């Protein structure tokens, strides 16, 4: 489960690099301020800066990364997703329609006037719950895209990631 999250993190970073022209040492327009959880049960929170200019390309990259990570999972492990999808986004779905229901949620929510008009430089990220074992804390990593629109897609995905633990 930690390895899935870590693969995902590579799939985001690598797709942001090839599609949105991101890199580790690119100056971010939007910078992540505070990244905490309301009730943390053994999760360590870091922030990795893989920033770029094209927010449209970023968003599509975060989807394509999440889509192929999900589809890489076995059908038994893959059947866990619809449940944890509803926990975070409170929308019903099923194994086959999850890949698009997520795209619809992101492409709608992250193209909202509020999101796209946001010139607030230092932005915060607030997730409500994250579970983790005592002997093995979970490593959460918000990949900063450098834009409100891209970070929106990361936070939408982040909310699914966190529900898998709990």
């Amino acid at each position: 489960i930690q390895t899935t999250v870590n693969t995902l993190s590579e799939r985001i970073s690598s797709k942001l690099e090839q599609e949105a022209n991101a890199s580790a040492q690119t100056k971010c327009d939007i910078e992540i301020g505070n990244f905490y959880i309301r009730q943390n049960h053994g999760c360590n929170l870091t922030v990795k800066n893989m920033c770029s200019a094209d927010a449209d390309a970023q968003l599509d990259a975060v989807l394509s990364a999440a889509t192929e990570t999900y589809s890489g999972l076995t059908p038994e492990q893959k059947a866990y997703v619809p449940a944890m999808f509803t926990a975070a986004l409170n929308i019903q779905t099923s194994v086959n329609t999850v890949v698009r229901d997520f795209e619809n949620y992101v492409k709608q929510t992250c193209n909202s006037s509020a999101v796209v008009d946001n010139k607030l430089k230092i932005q915060n990220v607030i997730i409500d719950e994250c579970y983790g074992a005592p002997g093995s804390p979970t490593n959460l990593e918000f990949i900063n895209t450098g834009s409100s629109k891209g970070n929106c897609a990361i936070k939408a995905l982040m909310q699914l990631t966190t529900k898998a633990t709990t």
Partner: antibody
Amino acid sequence: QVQLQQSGAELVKTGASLRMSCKSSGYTFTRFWMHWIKQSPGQGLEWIGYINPSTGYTEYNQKFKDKATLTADRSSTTAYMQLISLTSGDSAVYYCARSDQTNYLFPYWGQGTLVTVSA
Amino acid sequence: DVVMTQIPLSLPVSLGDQASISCRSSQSLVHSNGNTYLHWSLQKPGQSPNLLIYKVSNRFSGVPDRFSGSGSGTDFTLKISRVEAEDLGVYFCSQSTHDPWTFGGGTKLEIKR
């Protein structure tokens, strides 16, 4: 091949306003930032500010926060800079410059727009 | 806000000779990430500036190896080996470690004949 084609020279009255343009081509408009630089004879090369054509996000130099306003039209792959309250000290050559990937460099510069502030 | 200062204001140089141009800044140009963002540009008469060297040492697409940059912190120098007549212009050291970005006054390269 990258190309930044700025607008022609402009004469405008003092206290007035103007908007120069800079049309980019030969690269993905939304993929790289666009910066603006002033080259006066009195003061040297001064950095004005930058704009992200994709998100419209901008940052300005403290010295130019009231003088310059940067916009961008994705439709026509052009970026604009508006100058306000023109005075004699605004008379200079103004450059649009495209960023590198990291947004720390100016590989590509436009030919320059000459501004002349005189009644 | 960070002041770039170049010495000299201009430099007469013969063909084949080497040219040296220094640039001093008020603060260190090292950044949180560890990179030193100092660059050298050449503006010829009539033209717009072209980037020659970036981040102290690195040459730009299609810049001959006879251009090289050195230094760290605040003191930097640009060396132009084997000067050609085409090299004449005004060389600007600049920085992008601190906002606002800033340029030097420039050094004019006079070619001796």
